[PDB]
CSV table of C-alpha atoms (C1' of nucleotides) in Angstrom, one decimal:
chain,number,residue,atom,x,y,z
A,1,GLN,CA,0.0,0.0,0.0
A,2,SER,CA,1.1,3.6,-0.7
A,3,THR,CA,2.0,5.9,2.2
A,4,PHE,CA,2.7,9.6,3.0
A,5,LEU,CA,5.9,10.4,5.0
A,6,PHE,CA,5.7,13.7,6.8
A,7,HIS,CA,9.1,15.0,8.0
A,8,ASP,CA,10.8,18.2,9.4
A,9,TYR,CA,14.5,19.0,10.1
A,10,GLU,CA,15.7,21.3,12.9
A,11,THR,CA,19.2,22.5,11.7
A,12,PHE,CA,22.0,24.6,13.1
A,13,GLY,CA,21.7,27.1,10.2
A,14,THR,CA,20.1,28.1,6.9
A,15,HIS,CA,22.8,26.9,4.4
A,16,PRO,CA,22.0,23.2,4.0
A,17,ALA,CA,25.5,22.2,2.6
A,18,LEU,CA,27.6,24.2,5.1
A,19,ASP,CA,25.4,24.0,8.2
A,20,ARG,CA,24.7,20.8,10.1
A,21,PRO,CA,21.4,19.2,11.1
A,22,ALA,CA,20.4,19.2,14.8
A,23,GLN,CA,17.2,17.2,15.0
A,24,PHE,CA,15.0,15.0,12.7
A,25,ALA,CA,11.4,13.9,13.2
A,26,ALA,CA,9.0,12.0,10.9
A,27,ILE,CA,5.6,10.3,10.8
A,28,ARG,CA,4.3,7.6,8.5
A,29,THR,CA,0.7,7.9,7.4
A,30,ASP,CA,-1.8,6.5,4.8
A,31,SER,CA,-3.8,8.3,2.1
A,32,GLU,CA,-6.4,9.5,4.7
A,33,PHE,CA,-3.5,10.9,6.9
A,34,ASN,CA,-4.0,8.4,9.7
A,35,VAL,CA,-0.8,7.6,11.8
A,36,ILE,CA,0.9,4.3,10.8
A,37,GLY,CA,3.6,2.9,13.1
A,38,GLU,CA,5.6,4.8,15.8
A,39,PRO,CA,6.7,8.4,15.4
A,40,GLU,CA,10.4,8.7,14.6
A,41,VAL,CA,12.6,11.3,16.3
A,42,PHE,CA,16.4,11.6,16.6
A,43,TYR,CA,19.2,14.1,17.0
A,44,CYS,CA,22.5,14.5,15.1
A,45,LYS,CA,25.9,14.9,16.9
A,46,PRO,CA,27.7,17.9,15.4
A,47,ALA,CA,31.3,17.4,14.4
A,48,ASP,CA,34.2,19.2,16.0
A,49,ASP,CA,34.9,21.4,12.9
A,50,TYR,CA,31.7,23.4,13.0
A,51,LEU,CA,29.9,26.1,15.1
A,52,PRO,CA,26.1,26.7,14.7
A,53,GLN,CA,24.5,29.9,13.6
A,54,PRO,CA,23.6,31.7,16.8
A,55,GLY,CA,20.3,33.0,15.3
A,56,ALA,CA,19.3,29.5,14.3
A,57,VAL,CA,20.0,28.4,17.9
A,58,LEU,CA,17.8,31.2,19.2
A,59,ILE,CA,15.0,29.8,17.0
A,60,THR,CA,15.5,26.1,17.6
A,61,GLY,CA,16.5,26.3,21.3
A,62,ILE,CA,18.8,23.3,20.8
A,63,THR,CA,22.4,23.6,22.0
A,64,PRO,CA,25.3,21.5,20.6
A,65,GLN,CA,25.7,20.1,24.1
A,66,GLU,CA,22.1,18.7,23.9
A,67,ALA,CA,22.6,17.3,20.4
A,68,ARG,CA,26.0,15.8,21.4
A,69,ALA,CA,24.4,14.1,24.4
A,70,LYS,CA,21.1,12.9,22.8
A,71,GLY,CA,22.0,12.4,19.1
A,72,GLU,CA,23.9,10.0,16.9
A,73,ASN,CA,26.7,10.7,14.4
A,74,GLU,CA,25.9,12.0,10.9
A,75,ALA,CA,26.7,8.6,9.2
A,76,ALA,CA,24.0,6.9,11.4
A,77,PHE,CA,21.8,10.0,11.2
A,78,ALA,CA,21.8,9.6,7.4
A,79,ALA,CA,21.4,5.8,7.6
A,80,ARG,CA,18.2,6.1,9.7
A,81,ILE,CA,16.7,8.7,7.4
A,82,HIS,CA,17.8,6.8,4.2
A,83,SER,CA,16.2,3.7,5.7
A,84,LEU,CA,12.8,5.4,6.3
A,85,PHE,CA,13.0,7.3,3.0
A,86,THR,CA,13.7,4.3,0.8
A,87,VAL,CA,10.5,2.4,1.7
A,88,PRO,CA,8.6,1.7,-1.6
A,89,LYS,CA,5.4,3.6,-2.4
A,90,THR,CA,6.3,6.5,-0.1
A,91,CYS,CA,5.4,10.2,-0.8
A,92,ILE,CA,7.8,12.3,1.3
A,93,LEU,CA,6.6,15.8,2.2
A,94,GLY,CA,6.6,18.6,4.7
A,95,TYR,CA,6.4,22.4,4.7
A,96,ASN,CA,8.8,24.4,2.4
A,97,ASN,CA,10.7,21.1,2.1
A,98,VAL,CA,11.6,21.3,-1.6
A,99,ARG,CA,13.6,24.5,-1.1
A,100,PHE,CA,15.2,23.6,2.3
A,101,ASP,CA,14.7,20.2,4.0
A,102,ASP,CA,15.2,18.3,0.7
A,103,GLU,CA,18.4,20.3,0.2
A,104,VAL,CA,19.6,19.1,3.6
A,105,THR,CA,18.6,15.5,3.0
A,106,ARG,CA,20.5,15.6,-0.3
A,107,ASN,CA,23.7,16.8,1.3
A,108,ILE,CA,23.3,14.5,4.3
A,109,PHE,CA,23.2,11.6,1.8
A,110,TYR,CA,25.9,13.2,-0.4
A,111,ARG,CA,28.2,13.7,2.7
A,112,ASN,CA,27.6,10.1,3.9
A,113,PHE,CA,27.9,8.1,0.7
A,114,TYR,CA,24.1,7.6,0.1
A,115,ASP,CA,22.4,8.5,-3.3
A,116,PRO,CA,21.1,12.0,-2.9
A,117,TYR,CA,18.1,11.7,-5.3
A,118,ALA,CA,17.0,8.0,-5.5
A,119,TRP,CA,14.8,8.5,-2.3
A,120,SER,CA,12.6,10.9,-4.3
A,121,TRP,CA,11.8,8.6,-7.2
A,122,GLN,CA,13.1,5.0,-6.9
A,123,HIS,CA,10.6,2.3,-6.0
A,124,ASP,CA,7.6,4.3,-7.1
A,125,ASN,CA,8.5,7.2,-4.7
A,126,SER,CA,7.9,10.9,-4.9
A,127,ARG,CA,8.0,14.2,-3.0
A,128,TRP,CA,5.6,17.0,-2.2
A,129,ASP,CA,5.5,20.5,-0.7
A,130,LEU,CA,2.4,21.8,1.0
A,131,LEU,CA,3.4,25.5,1.2
A,132,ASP,CA,2.3,26.3,-2.4
A,133,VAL,CA,-0.7,24.0,-1.8
A,134,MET,CA,-1.9,26.5,0.9
A,135,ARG,CA,-1.2,29.5,-1.3
A,136,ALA,CA,-3.0,27.7,-4.2
A,137,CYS,CA,-5.9,26.8,-1.8
A,138,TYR,CA,-6.2,30.5,-0.6
A,139,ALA,CA,-5.7,31.9,-4.1
A,140,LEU,CA,-8.0,29.5,-6.0
A,141,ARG,CA,-10.3,27.8,-3.5
A,142,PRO,CA,-10.2,29.6,-0.1
A,143,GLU,CA,-13.8,28.7,1.1
A,144,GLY,CA,-13.7,26.5,4.2
A,145,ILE,CA,-10.4,27.5,5.9
A,146,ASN,CA,-9.5,30.6,8.0
A,147,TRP,CA,-6.7,32.6,6.4
A,148,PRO,CA,-4.6,34.9,8.7
A,149,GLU,CA,-4.0,38.5,7.5
A,150,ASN,CA,-0.7,40.3,8.1
A,151,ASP,CA,0.1,43.7,9.6
A,152,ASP,CA,-0.2,45.3,6.2
A,153,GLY,CA,-3.4,43.3,5.6
A,154,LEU,CA,-1.9,40.5,3.4
A,155,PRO,CA,-2.3,36.7,3.7
A,156,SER,CA,0.3,35.0,5.9
A,157,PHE,CA,1.3,31.3,5.3
A,158,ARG,CA,3.5,30.5,8.3
A,159,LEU,CA,2.6,27.1,9.7
A,160,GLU,CA,2.3,28.3,13.3
A,161,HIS,CA,0.0,31.2,12.1
A,162,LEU,CA,-2.2,28.8,10.2
A,163,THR,CA,-2.7,26.1,12.9
A,164,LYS,CA,-3.6,28.8,15.4
A,165,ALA,CA,-6.0,30.4,13.0
A,166,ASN,CA,-8.0,27.2,12.6
A,167,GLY,CA,-8.0,26.0,16.2
A,168,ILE,CA,-5.2,23.4,16.3
A,169,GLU,CA,-2.8,22.8,19.2
A,170,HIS,CA,0.2,24.9,18.0
A,171,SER,CA,1.7,25.4,21.5
A,172,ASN,CA,5.6,25.4,21.6
A,173,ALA,CA,6.4,26.1,17.9
A,174,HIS,CA,9.7,25.3,16.1
A,175,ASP,CA,9.7,21.7,17.4
A,176,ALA,CA,10.5,19.0,14.8
A,177,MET,CA,7.8,16.6,15.9
A,178,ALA,CA,5.3,19.3,16.9
A,179,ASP,CA,5.5,20.8,13.4
A,180,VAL,CA,4.8,17.4,11.6
A,181,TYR,CA,1.5,17.1,13.4
A,182,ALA,CA,0.7,20.7,12.5
A,183,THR,CA,1.5,19.9,8.9
A,184,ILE,CA,-0.5,16.6,8.8
A,185,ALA,CA,-3.4,18.6,10.4
A,186,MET,CA,-3.0,21.3,7.7
A,187,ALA,CA,-3.1,18.7,5.0
A,188,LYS,CA,-6.1,16.9,6.7
A,189,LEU,CA,-7.9,20.3,6.7
A,190,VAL,CA,-7.3,21.1,3.0
A,191,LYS,CA,-8.1,17.5,1.9
A,192,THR,CA,-11.5,17.8,3.7
A,193,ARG,CA,-12.3,21.4,2.9
A,194,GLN,CA,-11.2,21.2,-0.7
A,195,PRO,CA,-10.5,17.7,-2.1
A,196,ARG,CA,-10.6,18.4,-5.9
A,197,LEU,CA,-7.7,20.9,-5.7
A,198,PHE,CA,-5.8,18.8,-3.2
A,199,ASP,CA,-5.9,15.9,-5.6
A,200,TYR,CA,-5.2,17.9,-8.7
A,201,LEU,CA,-2.2,19.4,-7.0
A,202,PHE,CA,-1.2,16.0,-5.7
A,203,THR,CA,-1.4,14.1,-9.1
A,204,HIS,CA,0.3,17.2,-10.6
A,205,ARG,CA,3.3,17.0,-8.3
A,206,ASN,CA,4.9,14.9,-11.0
A,207,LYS,CA,7.4,16.3,-13.5
A,208,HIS,CA,5.7,14.4,-16.3
A,209,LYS,CA,2.2,15.3,-15.1
A,210,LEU,CA,3.0,19.0,-15.2
A,211,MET,CA,4.6,18.7,-18.7
A,212,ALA,CA,1.2,18.0,-20.2
A,213,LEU,CA,0.0,21.5,-19.4
A,214,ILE,CA,2.9,23.2,-21.2
A,215,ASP,CA,2.2,24.0,-24.9
A,216,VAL,CA,5.2,26.3,-25.6
A,217,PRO,CA,4.6,26.6,-29.4
A,218,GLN,CA,1.0,27.7,-28.8
A,219,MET,CA,1.9,29.7,-25.6
A,220,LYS,CA,-1.2,28.3,-23.8
A,221,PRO,CA,-1.8,30.5,-20.8
A,222,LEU,CA,-1.5,28.8,-17.4
A,223,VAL,CA,-2.4,29.8,-13.8
A,224,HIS,CA,0.8,29.8,-11.6
A,225,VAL,CA,0.9,30.1,-7.9
A,226,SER,CA,4.3,31.1,-6.3
A,227,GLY,CA,5.6,33.2,-3.4
A,228,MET,CA,7.8,35.0,-5.9
A,229,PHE,CA,4.8,36.9,-7.2
A,230,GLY,CA,3.6,38.6,-4.0
A,231,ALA,CA,1.0,38.3,-1.1
A,232,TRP,CA,-0.8,41.3,-2.6
A,233,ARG,CA,-1.4,39.2,-5.7
A,234,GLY,CA,-2.5,36.2,-3.6
A,235,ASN,CA,0.9,34.8,-4.7
A,236,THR,CA,-0.9,34.2,-8.0
A,237,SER,CA,-0.8,35.1,-11.7
A,238,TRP,CA,-1.4,34.1,-15.3
A,239,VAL,CA,1.7,33.0,-17.2
A,240,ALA,CA,2.7,32.0,-20.7
A,241,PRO,CA,5.5,29.6,-21.6
A,242,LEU,CA,7.9,31.2,-24.1
A,243,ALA,CA,10.5,28.4,-24.4
A,244,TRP,CA,12.4,25.5,-22.7
A,245,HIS,CA,15.5,26.6,-20.7
A,246,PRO,CA,18.4,26.0,-23.1
A,247,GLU,CA,20.8,24.3,-20.6
A,248,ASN,CA,18.6,23.1,-17.6
A,249,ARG,CA,16.1,20.5,-18.8
A,250,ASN,CA,13.7,20.8,-15.8
A,251,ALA,CA,13.2,24.6,-16.2
A,252,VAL,CA,10.8,26.4,-18.6
A,253,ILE,CA,10.8,30.1,-19.3
A,254,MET,CA,7.5,31.7,-18.3
A,255,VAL,CA,6.3,35.3,-19.1
A,256,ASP,CA,4.2,37.1,-16.5
A,257,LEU,CA,1.1,38.3,-18.4
A,258,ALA,CA,0.2,40.7,-15.5
A,259,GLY,CA,3.5,42.6,-15.9
A,260,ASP,CA,4.2,45.4,-18.4
A,261,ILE,CA,5.7,43.6,-21.5
A,262,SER,CA,7.2,46.7,-23.1
A,263,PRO,CA,10.9,46.0,-22.2
A,264,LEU,CA,10.8,42.7,-24.0
A,265,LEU,CA,9.4,44.5,-27.1
A,266,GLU,CA,11.8,47.4,-26.9
A,267,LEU,CA,15.2,46.3,-25.4
A,268,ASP,CA,17.5,43.6,-26.8
A,269,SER,CA,18.7,40.4,-25.0
A,270,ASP,CA,22.0,41.7,-23.6
A,271,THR,CA,20.4,44.7,-22.0
A,272,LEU,CA,17.3,42.7,-20.9
A,273,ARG,CA,19.5,40.2,-19.0
A,274,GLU,CA,21.3,43.1,-17.2
A,275,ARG,CA,17.8,44.5,-16.7
A,276,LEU,CA,16.5,41.2,-15.2
A,277,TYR,CA,19.2,41.0,-12.5
A,278,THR,CA,18.7,44.4,-11.0
A,279,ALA,CA,17.0,45.3,-7.6
A,280,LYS,CA,13.7,47.1,-7.4
A,281,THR,CA,15.2,49.7,-4.9
A,282,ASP,CA,18.2,50.7,-7.1
A,283,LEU,CA,16.1,50.2,-10.3
A,284,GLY,CA,15.1,53.5,-11.8
A,285,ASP,CA,11.8,54.6,-13.4
A,286,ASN,CA,11.5,51.6,-15.6
A,287,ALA,CA,9.3,48.5,-15.7
A,288,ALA,CA,11.0,45.3,-14.6
A,289,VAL,CA,11.3,42.2,-16.9
A,290,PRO,CA,8.1,40.2,-16.5
A,291,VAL,CA,9.8,36.8,-16.8
A,292,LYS,CA,10.5,33.9,-14.5
A,293,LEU,CA,11.5,30.2,-14.6
A,294,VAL,CA,9.4,27.3,-13.4
A,295,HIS,CA,11.3,24.2,-12.2
A,296,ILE,CA,9.0,21.3,-13.0
A,297,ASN,CA,11.0,19.0,-10.6
A,298,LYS,CA,10.4,21.5,-7.6
A,299,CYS,CA,6.7,21.0,-7.2
A,300,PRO,CA,5.5,24.1,-8.9
A,301,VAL,CA,1.7,24.8,-8.9
A,302,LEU,CA,0.5,25.0,-12.5
A,303,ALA,CA,-3.1,24.7,-13.7
A,304,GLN,CA,-5.1,25.8,-16.8
A,305,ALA,CA,-6.5,29.4,-17.1
A,306,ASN,CA,-10.1,28.5,-16.3
A,307,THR,CA,-9.1,27.2,-12.9
A,308,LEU,CA,-8.6,30.8,-11.9
A,309,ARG,CA,-12.2,32.1,-12.0
A,310,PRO,CA,-13.1,35.8,-12.8
A,311,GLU,CA,-14.5,36.0,-9.2
A,312,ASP,CA,-11.2,34.7,-7.7
A,313,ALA,CA,-9.4,37.2,-10.0
A,314,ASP,CA,-11.5,40.2,-8.7
A,315,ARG,CA,-10.8,38.9,-5.2
A,316,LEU,CA,-7.0,38.9,-5.8
A,317,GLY,CA,-6.9,42.1,-7.9
A,318,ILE,CA,-5.7,40.5,-11.1
A,319,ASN,CA,-6.7,42.1,-14.4
A,320,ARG,CA,-7.8,39.4,-16.8
A,321,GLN,CA,-8.1,41.8,-19.8
A,322,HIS,CA,-4.5,43.0,-19.3
A,323,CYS,CA,-3.3,39.4,-19.2
A,324,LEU,CA,-5.4,38.5,-22.3
A,325,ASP,CA,-3.9,41.5,-24.2
A,326,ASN,CA,-0.2,40.9,-23.5
A,327,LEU,CA,-0.8,37.3,-24.6
A,328,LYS,CA,-2.1,38.4,-28.0
A,329,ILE,CA,0.9,40.7,-28.3
A,330,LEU,CA,3.3,37.9,-27.4
A,331,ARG,CA,1.5,35.6,-30.0
A,332,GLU,CA,1.7,38.5,-32.5
A,333,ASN,CA,5.4,39.0,-31.8
A,334,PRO,CA,7.7,35.9,-32.2
A,335,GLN,CA,10.9,38.0,-32.0
A,336,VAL,CA,10.2,38.3,-28.3
A,337,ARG,CA,11.0,34.7,-27.7
A,338,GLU,CA,14.3,34.8,-29.6
A,339,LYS,CA,15.7,37.5,-27.4
A,340,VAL,CA,14.4,36.0,-24.1
A,341,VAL,CA,15.8,32.5,-24.4
A,342,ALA,CA,19.2,33.9,-25.2
A,343,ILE,CA,19.2,35.5,-21.8
A,344,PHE,CA,19.3,32.1,-20.1
A,345,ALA,CA,22.0,30.7,-22.5
A,346,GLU,CA,24.8,32.5,-20.8
A,347,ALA,CA,27.4,30.5,-18.9
A,348,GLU,CA,27.8,30.3,-15.1
A,349,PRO,CA,29.2,33.7,-13.9
A,350,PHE,CA,30.1,32.2,-10.4
A,351,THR,CA,33.4,30.3,-9.8
A,352,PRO,CA,32.8,26.9,-8.2
A,353,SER,CA,33.9,26.6,-4.5
A,354,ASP,CA,36.6,24.2,-3.5
A,355,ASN,CA,34.7,23.2,-0.3
A,356,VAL,CA,33.8,19.5,-0.9
A,357,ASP,CA,30.6,20.0,1.0
A,358,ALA,CA,29.3,22.5,-1.6
A,359,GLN,CA,30.1,20.5,-4.8
A,360,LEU,CA,26.9,18.3,-4.8
A,361,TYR,CA,25.8,19.8,-8.1
A,362,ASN,CA,29.1,19.2,-9.9
A,363,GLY,CA,27.5,16.4,-12.0
A,364,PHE,CA,26.2,12.9,-11.1
A,365,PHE,CA,28.3,10.0,-10.0
A,366,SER,CA,29.0,7.1,-12.3
A,367,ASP,CA,27.8,3.5,-11.9
A,368,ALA,CA,31.3,2.3,-11.0
A,369,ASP,CA,31.8,5.1,-8.4
A,370,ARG,CA,28.2,4.5,-7.2
A,371,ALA,CA,28.9,0.8,-6.7
A,372,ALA,CA,32.3,1.5,-5.2
A,373,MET,CA,30.7,3.9,-2.7
A,374,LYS,CA,28.3,1.1,-1.6
A,375,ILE,CA,31.3,-1.1,-0.8
A,376,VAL,CA,32.5,1.9,1.4
A,377,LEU,CA,29.1,1.8,3.2
A,378,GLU,CA,29.3,-2.0,3.7
A,379,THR,CA,33.0,-2.0,4.7
A,380,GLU,CA,33.5,-1.3,8.4
A,381,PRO,CA,35.2,2.0,9.4
A,382,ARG,CA,38.5,0.5,10.7
A,383,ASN,CA,39.1,-1.3,7.4
A,384,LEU,CA,38.3,1.7,5.2
A,385,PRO,CA,42.0,2.8,4.7
A,386,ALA,CA,43.2,-0.8,4.1
A,387,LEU,CA,40.7,-1.1,1.2
A,388,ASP,CA,42.5,0.2,-2.0
A,389,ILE,CA,39.8,1.6,-4.4
A,390,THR,CA,40.5,3.5,-7.6
A,391,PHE,CA,37.8,6.2,-7.6
A,392,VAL,CA,37.1,8.4,-10.7
A,393,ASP,CA,35.3,11.3,-9.2
A,394,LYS,CA,37.8,13.6,-7.4
A,395,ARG,CA,35.2,14.6,-4.8
A,396,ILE,CA,35.1,11.0,-3.4
A,397,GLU,CA,38.6,11.1,-1.8
A,398,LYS,CA,37.8,14.4,-0.1
A,399,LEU,CA,34.3,13.2,0.9
A,400,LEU,CA,35.9,10.0,2.4
A,401,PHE,CA,38.5,11.7,4.5
A,402,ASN,CA,35.8,14.1,5.9
A,403,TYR,CA,33.4,11.2,6.5
A,404,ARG,CA,36.0,9.2,8.4
A,405,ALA,CA,37.5,12.2,10.2
A,406,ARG,CA,34.1,13.7,11.3
A,407,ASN,CA,32.2,10.5,12.0
A,408,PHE,CA,35.1,8.2,13.1
A,409,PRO,CA,38.0,10.2,14.4
A,410,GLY,CA,39.4,7.2,16.3
A,411,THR,CA,40.0,5.5,13.0
A,412,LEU,CA,42.4,8.3,11.9
A,413,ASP,CA,46.2,7.8,12.0
A,414,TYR,CA,48.7,10.4,13.1
A,415,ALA,CA,49.2,12.3,9.8
A,416,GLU,CA,45.4,12.1,9.2
A,417,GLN,CA,44.9,13.4,12.8
A,418,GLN,CA,47.3,16.3,12.1
A,419,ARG,CA,46.0,17.4,8.7
A,420,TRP,CA,42.6,17.4,10.3
A,421,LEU,CA,43.9,19.5,13.2
A,422,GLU,CA,45.2,21.8,10.5
A,423,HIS,CA,41.8,21.8,8.7
A,424,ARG,CA,40.2,22.7,12.0
A,425,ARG,CA,42.8,25.4,12.6
A,426,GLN,CA,41.9,26.9,9.2
A,427,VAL,CA,38.2,27.0,10.2
A,428,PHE,CA,38.6,28.4,13.8
A,429,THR,CA,41.0,31.2,13.0
A,430,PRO,CA,41.3,34.1,15.5
A,431,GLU,CA,39.4,36.4,13.2
A,432,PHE,CA,36.7,33.7,12.7
A,433,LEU,CA,36.4,33.1,16.5
A,434,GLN,CA,36.4,36.8,17.2
A,435,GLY,CA,33.6,37.6,14.8
A,436,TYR,CA,31.7,34.7,16.4
A,437,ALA,CA,32.4,36.2,19.8
A,438,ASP,CA,31.4,39.6,18.4
A,439,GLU,CA,28.2,38.1,17.0
A,440,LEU,CA,27.4,36.5,20.4
A,441,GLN,CA,28.5,39.6,22.4
A,442,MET,CA,26.2,41.6,20.2
A,443,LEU,CA,23.2,39.3,20.5
A,444,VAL,CA,23.5,39.1,24.3
A,445,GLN,CA,23.5,42.9,24.3
A,446,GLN,CA,20.2,42.9,22.4
A,447,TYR,CA,18.3,39.9,23.9
A,448,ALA,CA,19.8,40.6,27.4
A,449,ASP,CA,16.3,40.7,28.9
A,450,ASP,CA,15.5,37.2,27.7
A,451,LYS,CA,17.2,34.9,30.2
A,452,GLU,CA,16.2,31.8,28.1
A,453,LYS,CA,17.9,33.5,25.1
A,454,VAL,CA,21.0,34.5,27.1
A,455,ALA,CA,21.3,31.0,28.6
A,456,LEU,CA,21.4,29.7,25.0
A,457,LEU,CA,24.0,32.3,24.0
A,458,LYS,CA,26.3,31.6,27.0
A,459,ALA,CA,26.1,27.9,26.2
A,460,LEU,CA,27.4,28.7,22.7
A,461,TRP,CA,30.4,30.5,24.2
A,462,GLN,CA,31.0,27.6,26.6
A,463,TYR,CA,30.8,25.2,23.6
A,464,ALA,CA,33.0,27.5,21.5
A,465,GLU,CA,35.5,27.4,24.4
A,466,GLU,CA,35.6,23.6,24.7
A,467,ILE,CA,35.5,22.8,20.9
A,468,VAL,CA,38.6,24.7,20.0
B,1,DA,C1',16.7,2.8,-16.3
B,2,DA,C1',17.2,7.8,-13.5
B,3,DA,C1',18.6,11.5,-10.8
B,4,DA,C1',20.9,17.9,-10.9
B,5,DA,C1',22.3,22.5,-11.3
B,6,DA,C1',23.8,26.5,-5.0
B,7,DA,C1',25.0,31.6,-6.1
B,8,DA,C1',23.0,38.2,-9.8
B,9,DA,C1',16.9,39.0,-9.2
B,10,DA,C1',11.7,38.7,-8.5
B,11,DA,C1',9.0,37.2,-2.7
B,12,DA,C1',8.4,34.8,1.4
B,13,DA,C1',8.7,30.4,3.9
B,14,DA,C1',12.4,27.8,6.6
B,15,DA,C1',16.7,27.3,10.4
DNA sequence: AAAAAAAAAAAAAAA
């Protein structure tokens, strides 16, 4: 039978590759969102070459001392998650998971010699993200659920703000296990209050399922829900697919039909590109480029025009006529496409980092390396160096040493212990430790009144003292 | 047989 796997990480920082996880929690459920099996919760021991983001710690309320005492090493941490995730017929999901948690999981698997993507697809698996489901529910089919307005009078979609707005036990927020229930409940609510949409959006979580909607040649208009648009637009707009992204295969170039389409008609590509990557604050008295990408593998909400009803339009302040006009102009002018696609054909302006943790997206691993890395998983730690393997991917050697050094220091010899002590010395430089102490010493002189917040800060200094 | 593109910028979620 098929199942839904709700999960939520509590990390030591925002950057998934560079920051480490602190806590993991997950619950297995059926299609009706009824709890199957026991709830899974466990902590991760942070390595001795990393300090947490003090902000993240003020949010999570979990000190490295607690995680070190309670948790397991990252190799086990990854094993337990990979065990749960690889169960056949499992749809893994959470809240804002595609653009955070899943990025963590991928690195956790990447750092600990597990396949970073297989969990999402292999054995009839998939993933889902409820965030845009809530935005789509509010935008398209709000009747039934209470929607919390912001200070400016705009719709908020923070989990804690939702569960409280619909009478659900949201006491003690930012807790791995407490958030999963709050998510499951939020799903259960939308499933009950609005099934059709919930199903549509579910079945249309698939890369190939979305594809069907895209008729680039005919520029068939589609409803697109995304936070990138804006809460004043119900995070919603009509869009038209101009062309497939020239390099990335999972991306497609969408034109915003609500935006002013003059720049595309007037300016050339080279200038448009520069015009696309400019801030609204420092941008002058010009209309911005009404173009964005949609990553069909990142659970984007797409539907056909008629899904967005003229009522729901008037409710969200979206001019249907203006969208219908620009479409006719875009259909009337092919030359617009030519210039647009060329914007996304340019090569990567950023130089790749030499930090092995951040190289996940430097291509896939081969079958030989993929197999050889399994033998590394099966081979016991102590016997890892004795095993002579000829790897192809230069990342593997650096990944290994870090794996063994972080997870199994006691398996290191003298040289390996020394070069690690150097690696650490390069991380915890006086100027790095000062800036940290400055960041703490600032925050304490800011949250001084909050004894709970201070206690957490002090703990970070006491940790920072005993780690170096 | 299949899986991906971090970071310029749009906004708003997550730690």
